[PDB]
């Protein structure tokens, strides 16, 4: 399987309580390892995983340095965008940035990412070639022209397919027993009568890692993907995730149904008959 390193940045302007709230989170796969919050007392890049705590002070000093530089440009970007769009200082706005990279099982570069959003809508993004950008509206085009003129993607590519990749490999090694682990889902089913003619079958998956999982309801073999309710995969809070899928079924035909479960932690996909 492949791995990934993700950084997520959020800046929300507070008119006029003061300056933007800034929050930064770093992920390795589905495991958070660092965090910064402009409102926290720490004012430092903080660790959120055991393996990252190994890094010396020069690393931490460097990261808090860089994460404040990040926020100071998002802080200026809020001002710039408000001007691009001709918006009033009245309303509150949001900038969101994500960047990162995927590597394969042998640690080879796979994909580089960098996407920006404004008020929850695509703004600008680096294309897959890591050499060109896509603007979402005519405002983002002003940004696009600026970044193209300055050749800003070159330095960005050098990070995405180089620095990012080499440090991801580093983390995967230092936290190998935490990050290169797999936790299979613990599964069971529950019955819920709605009326005299119907009932819900629910398939539960608990305590699994990583968070990617596929829960399919089947009837006599066929897939009922069209009539199944899934909830968003949720964190148990202890490093594992939970999820369920439900079908409304004619009673009594519950015995014709099966839950199919796929997960990187399972050696063979699961088939559970009610």
């Amino acid at each position: 399987g492949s791995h990934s390193m993700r950084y997520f940045f959020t800046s929300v302007s507070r008119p006029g309580r003061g300056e933007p709230r800034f929050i930064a989170v770093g992920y390795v796969d589905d495991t958070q390892f660092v965090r910064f919050d402009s409102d926290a007392a720490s004012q430092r890049m903080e660790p959120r995983a055991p393996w990252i705590e190994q890094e010396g002070p020069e690393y931490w000093d460097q990261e808090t340095r860089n994460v404040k530089a990040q926020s100071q440009t998002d802080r200026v970007d809020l001002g710039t965008l408000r001007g691009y769009y001709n918006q009033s200082e009245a309303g509150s706005h949001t900038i969101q940035i994500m960047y990162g990279c995927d590597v394969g099982s042998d640690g080879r570069f796979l994909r580089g990412y960098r996407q920006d959003a404004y008020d929850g809508k695509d703004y600008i993004a680096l294309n897959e070639d890591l050499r060109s950008w896509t603007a979402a509206d005519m405002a983002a085009q002003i940004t696009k022209r600026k970044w193209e003129a300055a050749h800003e993607a070159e330095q960005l590519r050098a990070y995405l397919d180089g620095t990012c990749v080499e440090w991801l490999r580093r983390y995967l090694e230092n936290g190998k027993e935490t990050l290169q682990r797999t936790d299979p889902p613990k599964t069971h089913m529950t019955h819920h009568p709605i009326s005299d003619h119907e009932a819900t079958l629910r398939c539960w998956a608990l305590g699994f890692y990583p968070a990617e999982i596929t829960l399919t309801w089947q009837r006599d073999g066929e897939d009922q993907t069209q009539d199944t309710e899934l909830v968003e995969t949720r964190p148990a809070g202890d490093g594992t995730f939970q999820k369920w899928a439900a079908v409304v079924v004619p009673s009594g035909e519950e015995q014709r149904y099966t839950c199919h479960v796929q997960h990187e932690g399972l050696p063979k996909p699961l088939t559970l008959r009610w």
Binding site: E63, T73, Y99, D116, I124, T143, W147, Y159, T163, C164
Partner: peptide, 9 residues
């Protein structure tokens, strides 16, 4: 590791 280079928008 955070990126070390930054450019305004």
């Amino acid at each position: 590791k955070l990126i070390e280079t930054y450019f305004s928008k």
